[PDB]
């Protein structure tokens, strides 16, 4: 029947076989291909799922603050009335003013007090704290579960100060520029900003499949049985009316 | 048994007790399943089903180990149970084979520590030295960047990892994740007198 | 590592630095060899048995509290408890009903020579 | 970024125009023009593709 | 094995990982600022790139 031929399709797709027994040479060629269609799909499902569970290659959210301008589900952050907060409220670039448009209208929680307090909001919530770019490179290599997404928004610069009018402005400028090209000023950076052992990550064995990994099947299983009862009462109405 | 957590193994066997019984309830409820196996002149009180409670429960296990059976779901009501319980099986076995092919390759992909350069990375495994011996004085005036980085651990985190004596230094390895650094002869004496120890590196 | 028999630690502070903090930890110890009721700390020490598993790591490395904690077993029974144990039993409350009803249907209603409606 | 160089408006050896342009350049960074001038010229003609 | 090796293969990604790739050749402009940077560099990866 049309019902019987359609429970030869699913019956050969889940690899259990059936009773419908293709007997003609015309029909067995369909059975000779639809079986071979199944045996590649299941052997490419098992092969690929044995690639996800051995090499986890996790993706990420936000990767550039322009794409953080869209994510209303992920809240922003700033230190309270620092250089960062004063940058956005007088900014002119439309994405950055729109980032201020969140934090101005919804102040109250997202503009935290201190940088050390600002890390814990990221560490315990969905937070997008905005600090100086060096202090990120100090925090990230001392706390290996954190990251820097994005690049550089503003360009400041540190600098050895001097009184207003002094020979020590110019003759340190000669001295600083030598240390950049000698390579010491980069080497001094890798003495102090280098973290204490953050490569602690590798492909870890999954240890299980849990209900968090495979739990949708039990949802599919429960939904199939509830659908079947609505089909089960369907013949009970259909046959009895045709019986009468 | 390891690639599936022990609540999944209970949830599978609870499902096999579940779905077999629900299929049994429908099989003596469905009207388009009562058939006649009569070879002769039909229609004389010989209309039956196939599904006992024993038969419906050897359709559950018979479709879970992927061998199929003879019980032959014939009604549209029963095939929907067969159309899901087959799909329940094909994900469980393909998640058992996939995960067991992750346990057996991660244990192959790992290499044991066999060279102090690779011990420079392992912050989870702590170093060691005898207190102010020849070994400790070697690293603090070393010049090779890996060895100074090995001193960079033990200088900043002194306090526990720079143990007092060589006999005291063995017990830290024997009772923790320790990487004690002594003279190369005394290793070759200790290793062959205490067979549960080893020399990694050169 | 005071050699002698008693110790007389001193705090000095003033109007300039009244707010200052420290927290000590002492421990009596005897040199080796080491008799019973004395956990022989490998730090050239012998401490009292009362200091074992109390919570202070006296012979500076945690030698007494290291290798000391009571734990449990039975990973099959590590979840027969609060909410996760109930949702096993909630579905066990479903499956057992689907079993006993499936007893009554097979016993009361046979297979051989009967009319085409029953079941529940 | 491997090295860190920097471009710069030059001046003769000893000049008031070293200092009073430094006042002027630092204003354009914070006003946002010096970034806006960068997105006038270094912005490309239609690469986007959404990757 | 085909589907997990290609996942385990990572792109070229940071000049330290370009120090390993002998199959991918380097480059520089001839005796510019870039070439003069590496030949007097001190960082071991960069001298190895000059090597
Ligand atoms: C929430 C959802 C609930 C919905 C409720 C679900 C209810 C679905 C119910 C389903 C049960 C009935 C459908 C299958 C028929 C069974 C075959 C059989 O027993 O012999 C049949 C022979 O019929 C034929 O002669 C033609 C058979 C080939 C085509 C079958 C129909 C294709 C419908 C494809 C899809 C089907 C529906 C798919 C549903 C998804 C019996 O024929 P008859 O009736 O005795 O003839 C009457 C003649 N008279 C007046 C003289 C007496
Ligand atoms: C009784 C019958 C037995 C025959 C056995 C045959 C066995 C194999 C024998 C020889 C091996 C084939 C090598 C030839 C190379 C294939 C050419 C190719 O590229 O693919 C071809 C597709 O069609 C095919 O793949 C041809 C082979 C399968 C034919 C149909 C299945 C055989 C049915 C029986 C087997 C199962 C039942 C078991 C039987 C007991 C053409 O591709 P294309 O369209 O040009 O692509 C360009 C289109 N595009 C531009 C849009 C992209
Ligand atoms: C006869 C039927 C009666 C029941 C017997 C069943 C037989 C087998 C009995 C037991 C087998 C084992 C139990 C199955 C579920 C496992 C428990 C579990 O935690 O999984 C899920 C819970 O699942 C739910 O809470 C869904 C809500 C009820 C189910 C509705 C099914 C379809 C409804 C009618 C269909 C209509 C038909 C179609 C029309 C549209 C996980 O949910 P979660 O919230 O994401 O978990 C949070 C944890 N996490 C975020 C870390 C992941
Ligand atoms: C005669 C019947 C023919 C029809 C076939 C069509 C098949 C197409 C199937 C699905 C359609 C695919 C299109 C995309 C929609 C998917 C979204 C969805 O609904 O998922 C839903 C679940 O999953 C289900 O409930 C749907 C499946 C129902 C039971 C399976 C029986 C299929 C029919 C018989 C097949 C037997 C063999 C085949 C031969 C017949 C979402 O679940 P939820 O309620 O949101 O849970 C909330 C809990 N949570 C918050 C923890 C998450
Ligand atoms: C592919 C689809 C197949 C589906 C078939 C599924 C069933 C297959 C049928 C039969 C196979 C065996 C069934 C065990 C299933 C769960 C047990 C378990 O999770 O393992 C746990 C214990 O497991 C054991 O070590 C052995 C069982 C313990 C005995 C007590 C429970 C059994 C009683 C009735 C059970 C049912 C109760 C509910 C019903 C009344 C973990 O093992 P371990 O102790 O940690 O190992 C020690 C070594 N190690 C620590 C170094 C690692
Ligand atoms: C894996 O990462 C997520 C995301 O950061 C962690 O989820 C947060 O965990 C902290 C600490 O317990 C909570 O304060 C947050 O409320 C959690 N957020 C969400 C959305 O769940 C999760 O804890 C991490 N996994 C582990 C084992 O720590
Ligand atoms: C990093 O974060 C995770 C939270 O999932 C935590 O388990 C881990 O201890 C954290 N690491 C440090 C050094 O705090
Ligand atoms: C090595 O292993 C344990 C310590 O983990 C010890 O009890 C055992 O006796 C040792 N084996 C020897 C000395 O052969
Ligand atoms: C200190 O020593 C005594 C005797 O060695 C021992 O019972 C216990 O560990 C300590 N004393 C008390 C009262 O706990």
Curated annotation (Swiss-Prot), chain B:
L-glutamate binds at residues 134-135, 183. Glycans are attached at residue 196. It comes from the Eukaryota. Residues 105-202 are extracellular. Highest expression is found in the olfactory lobe, piriform cortex, dentate gyrus, hippocampus, granular cell layer of the cerebellum, and in caudate-putamen. The keyword Signal applies. The chain crosses the membrane at residues 7-27, 84-104. GO terms for cellular component: axon; dendrite; dendrite cytoplasm; glutamatergic synapse; hippocampal mossy fiber to CA3 synapse; ionotropic glutamate receptor complex; kainate selective glutamate receptor complex; membrane. Its main location: membrane. It is found in: Cell membrane; Postsynaptic cell membrane. Sumoylation mediates kainate receptor-mediated endocytosis and regulates synaptic transmission. Sumoylation is enhanced by PIAS3 and desumoylated by SENP1. Ubiquitinated. Ubiquitination regulates the GRIK2 levels at the synapse by leading kainate receptor degradation through proteasome. GO terms for biological process: behavioral fear response; chemical synaptic transmission; detection of cold stimulus involved in thermoception; excitatory postsynaptic potential; inhibitory postsynaptic potential; intracellular calcium ion homeostasis; modulation of chemical synaptic transmission; modulation of excitatory postsynaptic potential. Keywords: Cell membrane, Disulfide bond, Glycoprotein, Ion channel, Ion transport, Isopeptide bond, Ligand-gated ion channel, Membrane, Phosphoprotein, Postsynaptic cell membrane, Receptor, Signal, Synapse, Transmembrane, Transmembrane helix, Transport, Ubl conjugation. Residues 28-83 are cytoplasmic. One of its GO terms (molecular function) is identical protein binding. Coiled coil: none annotated. Ionotropic glutamate receptor that functions as a cation-permeable ligand-gated ion channel, gated by L-glutamate and the glutamatergic agonist kainic acid. L-glutamate acts as an excitatory neurotransmitter at many synapses in the central nervous system. Binding of the excitatory neurotransmitter L-glutamate induces a conformation change, leading to the opening of the cation channel, and thereby converts the chemical signal to an electrical impulse. The receptor then desensitizes rapidly and enters a transient inactive state, characterized by the presence of bound agonist. The postsynaptic actions of Glu are mediated by a variety of receptors that are named according to their selective agonists. This receptor binds domoate > kainate > quisqualate > glutamate. It does not bind AMPA without coexpression with GRIK5. Belongs to the glutamate-gated ion channel (TC 1.A.10.1) family. GRIK2 subfamily. This is Glutamate receptor ionotropic, kainate 2.
Curated annotation (Swiss-Prot), chain C:
Glycans are attached at residue 48. N-glycosylated. Residues 33-69 form the LDL-receptor class A domain. Disulfide bonds join 34-46, 41-59, 53-68. It comes from the Eukaryota. The chain crosses the membrane at residues 85-105. Brain (at protein level). It is found in: Membrane. Interacts with GRIK2 and GRIK3, but neither with AMPA-nor with NMDA-sensitive glutamate receptors. Accessory subunit of neuronal kainate-sensitive glutamate receptors, GRIK2 and GRIK3. Increases kainate-receptor channel activity, slowing the decay kinetics of the receptors, without affecting their expression at the cell surface, and increasing the open probability of the receptor channels. Modulates the agonist sensitivity of kainate receptors. Slows the decay of kainate receptor-mediated excitatory postsynaptic currents (EPSCs), thus directly influencing synaptic transmission. This is Neuropilin and tolloid-like protein 2.
